[PDB]
Amino acid sequence: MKLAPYILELLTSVNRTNGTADLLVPLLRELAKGRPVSRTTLAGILDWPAERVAAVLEQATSTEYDKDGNIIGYGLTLRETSYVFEIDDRRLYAWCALDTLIFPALIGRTARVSSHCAATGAPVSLTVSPSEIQAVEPAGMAVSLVLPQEAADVRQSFCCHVHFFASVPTAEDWASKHQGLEGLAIVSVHEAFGLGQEFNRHLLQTMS
Ligand SMILES: [Br-]
């Protein structure tokens, strides 16, 4: 549908803290290897002062850490979620449905994505490559969107309301019960993948 309001707010959230975009893509690529990522490793890859890496990360209040303070989750995560993101036989996870559609282009890999419909519990799965989706099951799979909020916890304000559904009508029935969610909208998974492509396009512009 008319997804400009979502594109816009998603970008404002990345652009809100300088360096977030420059750090995101390298971190996603390293996490995609399936192992925890240290702050020092990230500094090395970015050629940034440690102080700089640390400031960006402190603004990203949903970031997940392990027992050593290594990064293990930033959209893409090693900690189990409802969104399975498998790349060459490494099972990783994503914070939400839209993340699984965005990451393949950013890490340059095709992913076997699977979840369950948030309305009915039905299995859903698809193959997401940098350019396209395939093997969409069910064909009519849908995604919920809400509007991102400034200075709100990203996982609790956005990611946790952005689900896969077995169909648009199934998703729309569900949405009619959750109209308190700001900007709640239902789109097809193809529309959501398109939204991810526009996000990624703008993101790569923001980068140095
Ligand atoms: Br609009």
Side-chain angles (χ1 to χ4, degrees):
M1 65 173 75
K2 313 185 117 142
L3 298 186
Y6 304 91
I7 296 163
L8 173 58
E9 294 307 334
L10 286 161
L11 295 169
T12 296
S13 64
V14 168
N15 296 329
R16 204 166 275 140
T17 297
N18 201 267
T20 300
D22 291 317
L23 176 143
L24 181 56
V25 172
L27 178 54
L28 291 176
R29 288 184 203 258
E30 205 65 22
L31 280 163
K33 293 175 189 177
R35 292 166 235 117
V37 182
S38 71
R39 275 181 297 276
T40 302
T41 291
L42 199 48
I45 299 287
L46 301 168
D47 187 39
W48 291 6
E51 325 194 84
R52 198 178 167 183
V53 169
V56 179
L57 289 169
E58 257 200 344
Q59 286 299 292
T61 55
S62 298
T63 304
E64 294 170 297
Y65 302 97
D66 73 4
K67 64 182 187 296
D68 289 327
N70 298 308
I71 306 158
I72 59 164
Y74 194 82
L76 188 64
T77 184
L78 314 178
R79 178 118 54 201
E80 195 176 340
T81 72
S82 288
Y83 307 95
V84 183
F85 190 86
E86 183 187 287
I87 50 172
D88 44 272
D89 295 323
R90 254 122 186 124
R91 198 172 162 101
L92 317 173
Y93 303 89
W95 287 354
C96 76
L98 184 62
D99 283 330
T100 74
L101 304 177
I102 287 172
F103 295 156
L106 296 182
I107 67 176
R109 310 268 203 114
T110 294
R112 292 178 26 110
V113 174
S114 52
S115 192
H116 293 85
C117 172
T120 68
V124 294
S125 65
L126 73 164
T127 297
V128 188
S129 76
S131 49
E132 70 180 339
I133 62 177
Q134 290 291 331
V136 184
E137 308 194 342
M141 193 189 306
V143 173
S144 53
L145 302 169
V146 296
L147 281 166
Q149 262 61 228
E150 11 173 4
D153 184 270
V154 187
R155 271 191 100 170
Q156 198 47 40
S157 61
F158 181 79
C159 298
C160 78
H161 304 301
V162 171
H163 310 279
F164 288 112
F165 297 87
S167 78
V168 163
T170 294
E172 278 168 355
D173 285 8
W174 173 95
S176 72
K177 299 178 182 303
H178 294 286
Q179 283 298 296
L181 296 169
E182 195 178 346
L184 179 64
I186 299 307
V187 306
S188 76
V189 69
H190 297 271
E191 291 175 285
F193 179 77
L195 165 62
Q197 294 180 296
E198 281 299 288
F199 176 80
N200 283 337
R201 185 174 71 78
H202 279 104
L203 178 67
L204 301 197
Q205 291 177 21
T206 287
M207 293 177 78
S208 311

